[PDB]
Amino acid sequence: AKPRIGYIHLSGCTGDAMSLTENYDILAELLTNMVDIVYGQTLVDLWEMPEMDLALVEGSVCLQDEHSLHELKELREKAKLVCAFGSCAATGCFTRYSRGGQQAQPSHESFVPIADLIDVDLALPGCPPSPEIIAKTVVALLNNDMDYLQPMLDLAGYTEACGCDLQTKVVNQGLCIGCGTCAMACQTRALDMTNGRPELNSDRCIKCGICYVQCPRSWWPEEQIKKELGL
Amino acid sequence: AKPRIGYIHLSGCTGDAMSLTENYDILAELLTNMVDIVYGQTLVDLWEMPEMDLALVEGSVCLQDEHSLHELKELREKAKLVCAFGSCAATGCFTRYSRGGQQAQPSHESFVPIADLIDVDLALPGCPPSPEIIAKTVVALLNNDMDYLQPMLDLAGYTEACGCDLQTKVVNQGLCIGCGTCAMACQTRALDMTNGRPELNSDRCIKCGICYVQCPRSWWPEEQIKKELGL
Amino acid sequence: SERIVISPTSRQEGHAELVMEVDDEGIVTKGRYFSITPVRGLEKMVTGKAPETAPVMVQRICGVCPIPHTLASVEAIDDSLDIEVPKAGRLLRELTLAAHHVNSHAIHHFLIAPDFVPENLMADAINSVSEIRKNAQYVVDMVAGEGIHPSDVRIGGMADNITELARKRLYARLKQLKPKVNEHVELMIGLIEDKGLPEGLGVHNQPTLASHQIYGDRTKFDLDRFTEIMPESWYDDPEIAKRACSTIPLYDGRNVEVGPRARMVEFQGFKERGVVAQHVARALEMKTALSRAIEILDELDTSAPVRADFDERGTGKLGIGAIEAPRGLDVHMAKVENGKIQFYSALVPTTWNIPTMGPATEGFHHEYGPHVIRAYDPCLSCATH
Amino acid sequence: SERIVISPTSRQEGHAELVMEVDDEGIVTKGRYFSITPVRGLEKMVTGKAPETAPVMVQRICGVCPIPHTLASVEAIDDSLDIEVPKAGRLLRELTLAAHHVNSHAIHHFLIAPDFVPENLMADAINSVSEIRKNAQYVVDMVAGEGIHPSDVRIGGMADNITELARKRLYARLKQLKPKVNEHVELMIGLIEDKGLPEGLGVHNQPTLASHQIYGDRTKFDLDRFTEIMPESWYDDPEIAKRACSTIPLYDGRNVEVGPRARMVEFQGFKERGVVAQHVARALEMKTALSRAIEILDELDTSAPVRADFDERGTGKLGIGAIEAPRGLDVHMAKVENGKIQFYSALVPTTWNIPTMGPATEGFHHEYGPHVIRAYDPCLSCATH
Amino acid sequence: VLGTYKEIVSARSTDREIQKLAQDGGIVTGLLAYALDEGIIEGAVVAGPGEEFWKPQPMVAMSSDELKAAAGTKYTFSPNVMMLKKAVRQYGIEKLGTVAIPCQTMGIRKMQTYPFGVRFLADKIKLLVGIYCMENFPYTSLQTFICEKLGVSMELVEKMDIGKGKFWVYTQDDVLTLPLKETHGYEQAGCKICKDYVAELADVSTGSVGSPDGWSTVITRTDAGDSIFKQAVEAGLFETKPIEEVKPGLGLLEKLAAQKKEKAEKNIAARKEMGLPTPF
Amino acid sequence: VLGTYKEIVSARSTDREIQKLAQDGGIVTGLLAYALDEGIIEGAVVAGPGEEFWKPQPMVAMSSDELKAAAGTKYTFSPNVMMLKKAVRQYGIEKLGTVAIPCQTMGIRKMQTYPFGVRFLADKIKLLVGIYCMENFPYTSLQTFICEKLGVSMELVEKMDIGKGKFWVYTQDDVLTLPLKETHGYEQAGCKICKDYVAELADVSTGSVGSPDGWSTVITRTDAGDSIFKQAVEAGLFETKPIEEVKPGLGLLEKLAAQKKEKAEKNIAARKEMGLPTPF
Numbered sequence A, B: 001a002k003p004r005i006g007y008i009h010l011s012g013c014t015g016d017a018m019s020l021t022e023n024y025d026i027l028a029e030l031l032t033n034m035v036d037i038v039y040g041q042t043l044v045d046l047w048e049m050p051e052m053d054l055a056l057v058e059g060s061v062c063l064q065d066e067h068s069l070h071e072l073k074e075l076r077e078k079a080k081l082v083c084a085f086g087s088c089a090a091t092g093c094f095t096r097y098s099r100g101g102q103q104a105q106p107s108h109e110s111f112v113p114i115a116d117l118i119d120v121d122l123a124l125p126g127c128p129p130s131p132e133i134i135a136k137t138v139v140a141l142l143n144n145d146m147d148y149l150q151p152m153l154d155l156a157g158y159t160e161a162c163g164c165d166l167q168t169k170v171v172n173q174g175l176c177i178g179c180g181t182c183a184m185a186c187q188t189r190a191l192d193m194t195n196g197r198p199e200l201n202s203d204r205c206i207k208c209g210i211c212y213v214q215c216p217r218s219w220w221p222e223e224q225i226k227k228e229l230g231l
Numbered sequence C, D: 001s002e003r004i005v006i007s008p009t010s011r012q013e014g015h016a017e018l019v020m021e022v023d024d025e026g027i028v029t030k031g032r033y034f035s036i037t038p039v040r041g042l043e044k045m046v047t048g049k050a051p052e053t054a055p056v057m058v059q060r061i062c063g064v065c066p067i068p069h070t071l072a073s074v075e076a077i078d079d080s081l082d083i084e085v086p087k088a089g090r091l092l093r094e095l096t097l098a099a100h101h102v103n104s105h106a107i108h109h110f111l112i113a114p115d116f117v118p119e120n121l122m123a124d125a126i127n128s129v130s131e132i133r134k135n136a137q138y139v140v141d142m143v144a145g146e147g148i149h150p151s152d153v154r155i156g157g158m159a160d161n162i163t164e165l166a167r168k169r170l171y172a173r174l175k176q177l178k179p180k181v182n183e184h185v186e187l188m189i190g191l192i193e194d195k196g197l198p199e200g201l202g203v204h205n206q207p208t209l210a211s212h213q214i215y216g217d218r219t220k221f222d223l224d225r226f227t228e229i230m231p232e233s234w235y236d237d238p239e240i241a242k243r244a245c246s247t248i249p250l251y252d253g254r255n256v257e258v259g260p261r262a263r264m265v266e267f268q269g270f271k272e273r274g275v276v277a278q279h280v281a282r283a284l285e286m287k288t289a290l291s292r293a294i295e296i297l298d299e300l301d302t303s304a305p306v307r308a309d310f311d312e313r314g315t316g317k318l319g320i321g322a323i324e325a326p327r328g329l330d331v332h333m334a335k336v337e338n339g340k341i342q343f344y345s346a347l348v349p350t351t352w353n354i355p356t357m358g359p360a361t362e363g364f365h366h367e368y369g370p371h372v373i374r375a376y377d378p379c380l381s382c383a384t385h
Numbered sequence E, F: 001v002l003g004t005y006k007e008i009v010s011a012r013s014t015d016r017e018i019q020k021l022a023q024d025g026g027i028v029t030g031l032l033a034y035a036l037d038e039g040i041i042e043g044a045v046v047a048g049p050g051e052e053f054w055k056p057q058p059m060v061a062m063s064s065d066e067l068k069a070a071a072g073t074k075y076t077f078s079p080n081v082m083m084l085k086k087a088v089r090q091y092g093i094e095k096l097g098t099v100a101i102p103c104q105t106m107g108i109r110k111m112q113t114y115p116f117g118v119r120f121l122a123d124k125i126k127l128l129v130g131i132y133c134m135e136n137f138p139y140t141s142l143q144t145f146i147c148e149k150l151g152v153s154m155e156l157v158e159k160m161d162i163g164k165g166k167f168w169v170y171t172q173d174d175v176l177t178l179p180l181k182e183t184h185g186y187e188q189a190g191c192k193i194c195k196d197y198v199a200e201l202a203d204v205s206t207g208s209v210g211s212p213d214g215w216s217t218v219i220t221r222t223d224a225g226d227s228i229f230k231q232a233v234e235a236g237l238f239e240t241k242p243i244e245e246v247k248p249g250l251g252l253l254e255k256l257a258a259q260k261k262e263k264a265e266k267n268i269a270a271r272k273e274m275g276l277p278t279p280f
């Protein structure tokens, strides 16, 4: 019995699904023998939503699109776990900047992370999340590795993010130690370091949350880190 | 029996106290007959903190300054009400950008709104709050006008603010109607309007929260508005 | 007549609806395809903002093809700012797109594999696609910063050049990939032909619009021939016209076809038309794209500048970025003045193709309709932006 | 000897500590004054950021005197960028500061009123101060956008000119204010003299440093004479030296006095020294400041440009903004390159005065010490920034 | 359902220049012009011409000519509140007028009662003229109506109007219309929860509904509103009729105001069921 | 209190060029150089020269010369982690080395275990050399020590060192010192809650403490760390002595590691009593 997974694309860009598929070596075995992708028209010819063990929900949801809202509601009913797949679903990401007014739907204006409308069980922030974190998450769910997954469960509550979080949650709190991990991680290169402190280029920030996610001073998963190092 | 008021300056710029004093016509009567400023060395020659009915606390607090922390703790013990006086105390305001490293105290790095360390009863966001809101607040407290003061009590919980709040709390939520009130209010002129939607110049944002405070769609004090109009 | 509705159409990027009116025998007499993807509104998002913001945001139109949006954006802005990009930066931009074509066409083979690849060959096909994408994406990661939403395509050129270590590593891997891509293309073309789709399926009389064989050429996009209308003046069913989420761009007053077949027709003397031709052109273009990337890696001077200095204030000049995305001509237009984006418009390949796709289902059984759609490799987040 | 500590000293802006060593008769033999205000760290805050950010942030050094910080910041940045500000923008900057002096000196009279104003005159004095500030602040609000943290002092000049309505309204109010300011100054000077402070109180031999009589002049701030050291090499008590929060700027290797008396000595032939002289100079400067603002309003062309165009990338040039703040010379230094602030330093008037203030308490009873301090109108958020 | 008011009349400007330029009775332009000429105000913020046809920009008018140049309705955004503080700073104005649709009136009244970040503006507003509103449109929606559905262009439109169940465009020689229900879904979503039709918090409120063509239904509300409008009438700048004597009259106004409120309450309730933040 | 390890030795590079340039035993420069020459790594991120004296900048070294140019300690910030992704993108590196103080080692290991936003970097790190750390200083604090207290300048400093209760500066002909307790309060506040002295999560960790001058105490930890360091020794690039045979020896290392942990736990507890967020 393979885990039944749905991949539901709302107002996303499909980059998250693409990242999943850049687990090149294992992809054929993953799709054919490890999990069962049972729903999501990007991948499956099925127009009646089935029960799922896990829904990977990509994209924010548009408050002015009735079908998106119904689809989100239905997948919450039919999936045991809902994962906000990528920062648009998890934090709104760059759709936080949408403000409507464009053809051919000038009223399409308002986009929110999915937890603003439904209960979310875990999250994978990232724009997109790395092929590695996606593979490790799926394997963990396969093997019931709940110790590994705890940060994903916790991150379900991180739904409004910005590079300024490094100030408000780290530097302001007396926690920053100038390591540069945040600047290493930022997928848009919005971050530099000035005199050992993060420097935000707001013109490049997509509000994805990854800098604060990777900061060693936001949360420190010591036991899992040592386990993997054999220490 | 005049209300006993303390004015305590932490890591502020004293602009809030200056704004209070730009109630020009009433100032002499205010200080001499309406209230009793009993503590705050900016104004009063007293080095033993007394009991207060209201503490107006200006400025954020530096986590690396022991005296600031003790002074904040003591005023919470001795004041019946604590008001975060101005956005530095209320939201951190521009000290949210501080990151240490400057002479003559390179370790002075971390600044937080006072509610991060103590219970705050009401707040006056603004950089500085207008002479009018300060006068109206004091008069309201004098007259026990709790209906008028309710938004100030509520705003005690608004401690992390930014111009992006207009997106995350209004535009994203389907609430923006393009009135321009936010751009009118912004004291740094960080806001413009583009196609009827707020446009943030992040280079000028001081994270004071005033745009969201004044937005008619953040909270709507209808009864008090009509009362004052005679409608 | 009866209405067959498929919503959303499957195994493509993003959500569209196909509506087919069919006669008693199930033959399509009237076909309409339209976006039901919500409008995130990238054009109106970047209007009013700093020029540096636009490439970052518009690449997130689509995570299947972010490379050509980043390129079209910086080319439009370069053009608005009268920037001349240094030779090594131009080559790295071209190399990034050439590698990207290989990746993207391989992604389409993945999506259409259920239609064309026998069950017993399916594991092999996924593994073939994956090895090809792995090698293509080494280029996009090393040169452009990230393999999805590359960070280092920039106004004025690229963020940085690459090392000799990088250049020679990429060269060897792409050249050694040639026989694998040749074998894969041969295999896919044979399977597409083996499906036995009816003769003439999807053949239409619309123009083929293409600016260049493999990168792009703004001098071939003629604003005296381009117009843009809205669904309300295109679709003749008013309910559909109100639901449709993408605009309707036209050339010489008519709807067109863009993409690999269009480029092959306009630049490589390709004479085949319709669904099978579209797949065949796309597979053959993998040869073109990989060969070009190999040659650029051979030519590249890793010690040379890759980025021009520039004054970002602007003069109010309309800049055009015309890029051949894997799915077709991707035009971004940008006007910079007072250091802000004053105007922005994107005419993205699937945006062009959508008005052509519905009618191209007509004349054959509706069960062939979905195959007509997938031949365009449609991308609805792209179409709608 | 015994230590008298006052912490913080009262009726000034911000928090400083005064430590006086006194003999058996209570006479100060050794006085030290230092900042215990935490370092918000404005210089290191704006370093690394866009030039437009610096005036917005550094004006929030202080809400008593934000006007001269905004001016010194934009002047330093203008100088770094080789900008020539149009005549009307220069006049509006000067007018804003002139009005600001009137407001600020009036604020100091408010703060020192308990020391000098008889109880029966106290209501009158507060009302006098308030009417003066009301009229001064009409100028700062209308011209510069906000009366505290003015938004519209900008790199390249001002955001906008004012209307004839505004100009003529302000002119009439300031000119009609002249007799009131003259009466107020006469009154304050009489009261300061009436207090009967001991002859010689606060007289020292330190230089008077001033760049201009009322606005500022970067050509009079000589970098061949300026140095900056830290408290650890200034104060000779190591506990104090470690606690002190402000730097120690020097001229010709020595500590100085800045402020109204300094300007009056250097530019208006003033010959009096010490505490009473400092108050008297400050009151008299209200006449100077109001007269200048009136004349600028008469001269101003409301139809003329107020802001230059500029390329904000920079060339790495060190720019100097030297402004005569109400409390003294306020120098900001800024280097713009690659469109960012690469270097920023502020040498603020109370920063200069602090090393001079402690020793100026020596030789008189410690009960006079606090009066020596207030004569400098110290601003500790300013000093520390 | 009409809010608190002192009097309701039907009215029209007596100024032929204003009559030619006005959307309806010319109440806004006429009243601001009267207040300006009398020194009751020194300027007013209005929706003036912008950089695209029928895409206005807020501006501070300090002459009758500038007020007149702003006359006529544009059914798209003009965030008039944004210019109120500039008007009392560099423009030097201490007696300010403005025109506002109901949601803009709300931001202004909220500012006056709670001026947290707004220094020395609240008491300078001397005349707030409200205009009736049922919905507003992004500019691209107007283009869909005008350039796509009706087959002309923004430049060919000499006047636009809404009424009697239709959206109207006047060209140099033609009158083109769409059923108003056809514009549903093209308006900004924020209008869905709006309860205020007749600008209930304005000093004086005015609109076309309830009055015949070229006339306006004028609701005076505050002491300032009633007294300034009565002054202008007495000075012969407006002709007025009791609203009870006019067709269609108050019944239609009350119907539409009640329709708007019922719709808003349904949509507000829908928001709360979804768990979305709602200030109403 | 020393974390998990395989072996602890005292060691010194046998390369005289490296000996001349090294802070201590030249373990970092020697080991990265060996790994580079053997093809175990293709480059390494190090703290290289910057734009001010003793103010380093992270950089990707791809030759022994560049590694050598980075040798020697700078007691201020060099956020080395920031360059790890650039190193595997445009620099083309698939086998990466780096040197890191303990908090940087933590960010790196956190990334490898949880690479949420970090694509194709984690498995490319082949050698992580940790160096011991008790505190780090903003650059202005170093200036206070050197320019103000000791009365020279940053340019006159040829080497800086910390040990035996003192901060040390070497000039062209003079050795100047401060008591280390005199630097208390000048270090970044974030160090207060740091529990990791000997870089417990590194592949190999090294520092001066426990060894005599010019030698280093080397703790091998992971299979990669132990095997690469043993390889270099066998190749005669390091001389080693059992740590039990060396003065001051392991006792001093364990003392300082335990001091650091006790201090951190007190400060972590203080944070929690204040209600401040704490990841430990």
Ligand SMILES: Cc1cc2nc3c(=O)[nH]c(=O)nc-3n(C[C@H](O)[C@H](O)[C@H](O)COP(=O)(O)OP(=O)(O)OC[C@H]3O[C@@H](n4cnc5c(N)ncnc54)[C@H](O)[C@@H]3O)c2cc1C
Residues within 6 Å of the ligand: E021, E022, E023, E024, E025, E026, E027, E028, E029, E030, E046, E047, E048, E056, E070, E071, E072, E073, E074, E075, E076, E077, E078, E079, E080, E099, E100, E101, E131, E132, E133, E134, E135, E136, E137, E162, E206, E207, E208, E209, E216
């Ligand atoms: C978005 C919108 C929706 C409306 N819907 C209806 C309604 O539901 N029912 C009804 O009876 N009336 C409607 N009106 C009001 C109406 O169209 C008139 O503007 C009103 O009757 C005033 O006409 P007048 O002849 O008195 O003013 P005029 O003398 O023509 O002056 C009109 C004034 O309105 C201002 N103005 C024009 N467009 C805008 C805008 N977009 N935003 C802000 N100010 C503007 C102009 O600056 C000018 O000062 C609407 C107006 C708008 C702007």
Ligand SMILES: Cc1cc2nc3c(=O)[nH]c(=O)nc-3n(C[C@H](O)[C@H](O)[C@H](O)COP(=O)(O)OP(=O)(O)OC[C@H]3O[C@@H](n4cnc5c(N)ncnc54)[C@H](O)[C@@H]3O)c2cc1C
Residues within 6 Å of the ligand: F021, F022, F023, F024, F025, F026, F027, F028, F029, F030, F046, F047, F048, F056, F070, F071, F072, F073, F074, F075, F076, F077, F078, F079, F080, F099, F100, F101, F131, F132, F133, F134, F135, F136, F137, F162, F206, F207, F208, F209, F216
């Ligand atoms: C902030 C700091 C605090 C330290 N405190 C102590 C400690 O508590 N106890 C102890 O025994 N050792 C201390 N060290 C370690 C020590 O000083 C040595 O760096 C270590 O012994 C390595 O010496 P080596 O001769 O083996 O390396 P070398 O061959 O000299 O090479 C030194 C390497 O360290 C890197 N480096 C130098 N400065 C920095 C920096 N600021 N950040 C990151 N990398 C850097 C260089 O790039 C170089 O690659 C400290 C080091 C730093 C940087």
Ligand code: NFU
Residues within 6 Å of the ligand: C013, C062, C063, C064, C065, C066, C068, C069, C104, C325, C326, C327, C328, C330, C348, C349, C350, C351, C378, C379, C380, C381, C382, C383
């Ligand atoms: N190729 C491609 Fe995209 Ni997802 C499309 N259509 C475009 O630019």
Ligand code: NFU
Residues within 6 Å of the ligand: D013, D062, D063, D064, D065, D066, D068, D069, D104, D325, D326, D327, D328, D330, D348, D349, D350, D351, D378, D379, D380, D381, D382, D383
């Ligand atoms: N005047 C003044 Fe400030 Ni609050 C001081 N000192 C300075 O620039």
Ligand code: SF4
Residues within 6 Å of the ligand: A011, A012, A013, A014, A015, A016, A058, A059, A085, A086, A087, A088, A089, A093, A094, A126, A127, A128, A129, C060, C063
């Ligand atoms: S998180 Fe990034 S990759 Fe994923 S849907 Fe959003 S923009 Fe696309």
Ligand code: SF4
Residues within 6 Å of the ligand: A166, A170, A171, A175, A176, A177, A178, A179, A180, A181, A182, A183, A196, A197, A198, A214, A215, A216, A217, F107
């Ligand atoms: S990752 Fe965290 S601790 Fe490290 S520099 Fe960034 S904000 Fe500071």
Ligand code: SF4
Residues within 6 Å of the ligand: A161, A162, A163, A185, A186, A187, A188, A189, A190, A191, A200, A204, A205, A206, A207, A208, A209, A210, A211, A212
């Ligand atoms: S700084 Fe970078 S990582 Fe952080 S939220 Fe912004 S884009 Fe994401």
Ligand code: SF4
Residues within 6 Å of the ligand: B011, B012, B013, B014, B015, B016, B058, B059, B085, B086, B087, B088, B089, B093, B094, B126, B127, B128, B129, D060, D063
């Ligand atoms: S809120 Fe503004 S005026 Fe008040 S202390 Fe902060 S910077 Fe000063």
Ligand code: SF4
Residues within 6 Å of the ligand: B166, B170, B171, B175, B176, B177, B178, B179, B180, B181, B182, B183, B196, B197, B198, B214, B215, B216, B217, E107
């Ligand atoms: S004040 Fe609020 S409703 Fe009005 S434009 Fe600003 S964000 Fe939108």
Ligand code: SF4
Residues within 6 Å of the ligand: B161, B162, B163, B185, B186, B187, B188, B189, B190, B191, B200, B204, B205, B206, B207, B208, B209, B210, B211, B212
């Ligand atoms: S946009 Fe303006 S009002 Fe809003 S938080 Fe920023 S500075 Fe304050």
Ligand code: SF4
Residues within 6 Å of the ligand: B177, E101, E102, E103, E104, E133, E134, E135, E136, E190, E191, E192, E194, E195, E196
């Ligand atoms: S309906 Fe209400 S919210 Fe919408 S534009 Fe009109 S007054 Fe504003």
Ligand code: SF4
Residues within 6 Å of the ligand: A177, F101, F102, F103, F104, F133, F134, F135, F136, F190, F191, F192, F194, F195, F196
């Ligand atoms: S003591 Fe810890 S937090 Fe501080 S610099 Fe050293 S390793 Fe980093």
Ligand SMILES: [Cl-]
Residues within 6 Å of the ligand: C051, C052, C055, C153, C154, C155
């Ligand atoms: Cl760029």
Ligand SMILES: [Cl-]
Residues within 6 Å of the ligand: D051, D052, D055, D153, D154, D155
């Ligand atoms: Cl500026």
Ligand SMILES: [Mg+2]
Residues within 6 Å of the ligand: A104, A105, A106, C230, C231, C232, C241, C242, C244, E144
């Ligand atoms: Mg439409």
Ligand SMILES: [Mg+2]
Residues within 6 Å of the ligand: B104, B105, B106, D230, D231, D232, D241, D242, D244, F144
């Ligand atoms: Mg110090």
